[PDB]
Amino acid sequence: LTKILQQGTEFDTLAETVLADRFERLVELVTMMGDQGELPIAMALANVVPCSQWDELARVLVTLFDSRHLLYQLLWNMFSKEVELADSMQTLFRGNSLASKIMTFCFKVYGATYLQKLLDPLLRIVITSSDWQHVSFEVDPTRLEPSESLEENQRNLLQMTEKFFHAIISSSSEFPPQLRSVCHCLYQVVSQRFPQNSIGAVGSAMFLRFINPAIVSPYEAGILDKKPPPRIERGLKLMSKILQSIANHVLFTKEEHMRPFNDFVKSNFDAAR
Amino acid sequence: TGPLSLRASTHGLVINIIHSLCTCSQLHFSEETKQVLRLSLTEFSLPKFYLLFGISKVKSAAVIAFRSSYERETFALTSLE
């Protein structure tokens, strides 16, 4: 079967070659990109497609332009639309739109290996060491049981935050090149959009759609094969919230128990930047 | 060094090392680097490198690496070079 399978292009049918040529011509038909302007097929499909197919469209688009090595320009056009369609710096790309679906699929297909390799040792510390420690993670005074201590939970949660954050800052050197290209493509158009915290919105989206979803749901990511204990789950949700507040360059307001953590959040602004 | 099984196992070790060296996304090598590694894998597949590794007369190293399931030649340092 191997030697049959690699036989060549002389044994295939006329129907097969005509079908292949017609498919290739259709693929080229999309990938024609005119000078000084965005690619026409993508602009049509961005504004025509019903919502129920939107993510599916994103998927095939990510499968296409990357295999033609043109993924950078596709992302350029999509973000170039999204920067003027969205006004507020907080509301940029957070809502359900095609830019969100495309960058979410890009994170899922590219950074899975990097995210898993970064995340599993900080997981394994919790799996064994802090588990027999059984350090509690309740910081809400109303949700706190009387037996537990507020300050000890806060200190454990704090130490866990610096461990995770410093692990990411250490792994700053390690990214796949495609993900870095995606971040660069986002950053350039965002800097065109505003001169204030162009890097900051990049960081907020970066923690928003890639980092924090794995932290809240490690089992759903497939990094951890088992469902963790619920105290650890609550703590990991708190990790995601605090790191998101770091990325947003703003401190907690409603949670009084997060107010001491605001100093550590604002302390790490420049390192994260 | 050693019997036929360990020498064949060493050859399989070298081949698997290069094979996993090119086929992994962790290292994210360049394309030309992958080309020269692909060339190196082919040149280690050659019978000349069988005779360098001390395995002679054996068609497939992978077959006799597991042959129990289913020292006479001297060693020269130029082959090691």
Short mmCIF file of N, CA and C in Angstrom, two decimals, chain B residues 23-67:
data_model
loop_
_atom_site.label_atom_id
_atom_site.label_comp_id
_atom_site.label_asym_id
_atom_site.label_seq_id
_atom_site.Cartn_x
_atom_site.Cartn_y
_atom_site.Cartn_z
N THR B 23 11.81 15.66 14.12
CA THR B 23 10.34 15.62 14.19
C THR B 23 9.81 16.00 15.57
N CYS B 24 10.08 17.21 16.01
CA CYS B 24 9.45 17.71 17.22
C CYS B 24 9.29 19.21 17.11
N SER B 25 8.16 19.71 17.59
CA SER B 25 7.83 21.12 17.50
C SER B 25 8.40 21.94 18.64
N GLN B 26 9.02 21.28 19.62
CA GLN B 26 9.55 21.99 20.78
C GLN B 26 10.75 22.84 20.40
N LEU B 27 11.63 22.30 19.56
CA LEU B 27 12.87 22.99 19.25
C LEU B 27 12.67 24.12 18.25
N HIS B 28 11.63 24.01 17.41
CA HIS B 28 11.30 24.95 16.32
C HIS B 28 12.53 25.38 15.52
N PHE B 29 13.17 24.41 14.88
CA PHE B 29 14.35 24.64 14.07
C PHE B 29 14.01 25.38 12.78
N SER B 30 15.05 25.81 12.08
CA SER B 30 14.89 26.39 10.76
C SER B 30 14.73 25.29 9.71
N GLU B 31 14.37 25.71 8.49
CA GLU B 31 14.11 24.75 7.43
C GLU B 31 15.39 24.13 6.90
N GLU B 32 16.42 24.94 6.68
CA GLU B 32 17.70 24.43 6.17
C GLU B 32 18.35 23.49 7.17
N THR B 33 18.21 23.80 8.46
CA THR B 33 18.67 22.89 9.49
C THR B 33 17.94 21.55 9.41
N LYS B 34 16.63 21.59 9.16
CA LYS B 34 15.90 20.34 8.99
C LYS B 34 16.37 19.61 7.74
N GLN B 35 16.78 20.35 6.71
CA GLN B 35 17.30 19.71 5.51
C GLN B 35 18.60 18.97 5.79
N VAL B 36 19.52 19.60 6.54
CA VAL B 36 20.80 18.95 6.77
C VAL B 36 20.64 17.78 7.75
N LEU B 37 19.71 17.89 8.70
CA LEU B 37 19.43 16.74 9.56
C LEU B 37 18.80 15.60 8.77
N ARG B 38 17.93 15.92 7.82
CA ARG B 38 17.34 14.89 6.97
C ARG B 38 18.40 14.21 6.13
N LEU B 39 19.37 14.98 5.65
CA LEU B 39 20.50 14.39 4.93
C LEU B 39 21.33 13.49 5.83
N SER B 40 21.54 13.92 7.08
CA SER B 40 22.34 13.14 8.01
C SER B 40 21.68 11.81 8.34
N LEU B 41 20.36 11.81 8.47
CA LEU B 41 19.65 10.56 8.73
C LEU B 41 19.84 9.58 7.58
N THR B 42 19.77 10.07 6.35
CA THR B 42 20.01 9.23 5.19
C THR B 42 21.43 8.70 5.17
N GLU B 43 22.41 9.52 5.55
CA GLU B 43 23.79 9.05 5.47
C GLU B 43 24.10 8.06 6.58
N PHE B 44 23.44 8.18 7.74
CA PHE B 44 23.57 7.14 8.75
C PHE B 44 22.85 5.87 8.35
N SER B 45 21.86 5.97 7.47
CA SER B 45 21.22 4.74 6.99
C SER B 45 22.11 3.92 6.06
N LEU B 46 23.24 4.47 5.63
CA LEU B 46 24.06 3.82 4.61
C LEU B 46 24.80 2.62 5.20
N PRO B 47 25.15 1.63 4.36
CA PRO B 47 25.92 0.48 4.86
C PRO B 47 27.33 0.83 5.31
N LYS B 48 27.87 1.94 4.81
CA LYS B 48 29.18 2.39 5.26
C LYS B 48 29.16 2.70 6.75
N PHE B 49 28.09 3.33 7.22
CA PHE B 49 27.97 3.57 8.65
C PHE B 49 27.59 2.31 9.42
N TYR B 50 27.00 1.30 8.77
CA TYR B 50 26.91 0.00 9.43
C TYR B 50 28.30 -0.55 9.73
N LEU B 51 29.20 -0.50 8.75
CA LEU B 51 30.54 -1.02 8.97
C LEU B 51 31.31 -0.15 9.96
N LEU B 52 31.02 1.15 9.99
CA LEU B 52 31.60 2.00 11.03
C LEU B 52 31.10 1.59 12.41
N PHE B 53 29.82 1.27 12.53
CA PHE B 53 29.25 0.92 13.83
C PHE B 53 29.53 -0.52 14.23
N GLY B 54 30.25 -1.28 13.40
CA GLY B 54 30.62 -2.63 13.74
C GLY B 54 29.61 -3.68 13.32
N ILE B 55 28.44 -3.26 12.85
CA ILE B 55 27.43 -4.20 12.37
C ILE B 55 27.68 -4.47 10.89
N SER B 56 28.06 -5.70 10.59
CA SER B 56 28.26 -6.14 9.22
C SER B 56 27.33 -7.31 8.96
N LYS B 57 27.05 -7.56 7.68
CA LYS B 57 26.29 -8.70 7.17
C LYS B 57 24.81 -8.65 7.54
N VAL B 58 24.40 -7.70 8.37
CA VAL B 58 23.03 -7.61 8.86
C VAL B 58 22.30 -6.59 8.00
N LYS B 59 21.19 -7.02 7.40
CA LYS B 59 20.44 -6.15 6.51
C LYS B 59 19.71 -5.06 7.27
N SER B 60 19.04 -5.42 8.37
CA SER B 60 18.22 -4.49 9.13
C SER B 60 18.64 -4.52 10.59
N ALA B 61 19.08 -3.37 11.10
CA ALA B 61 19.47 -3.28 12.50
C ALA B 61 18.26 -3.42 13.42
N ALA B 62 17.10 -2.92 12.98
CA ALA B 62 15.91 -2.97 13.81
C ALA B 62 15.43 -4.40 14.01
N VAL B 63 15.67 -5.27 13.03
CA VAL B 63 15.24 -6.66 13.15
C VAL B 63 16.04 -7.38 14.23
N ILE B 64 17.37 -7.27 14.18
CA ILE B 64 18.19 -7.98 15.16
C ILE B 64 18.34 -7.22 16.46
N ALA B 65 17.81 -6.00 16.54
CA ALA B 65 17.74 -5.32 17.83
C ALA B 65 16.80 -6.05 18.78
N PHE B 66 15.81 -6.75 18.24
CA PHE B 66 14.81 -7.46 19.02
C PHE B 66 14.83 -8.96 18.75
N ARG B 67 15.96 -9.50 18.29
CA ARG B 67 15.95 -10.83 17.68
C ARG B 67 15.80 -11.94 18.71
#
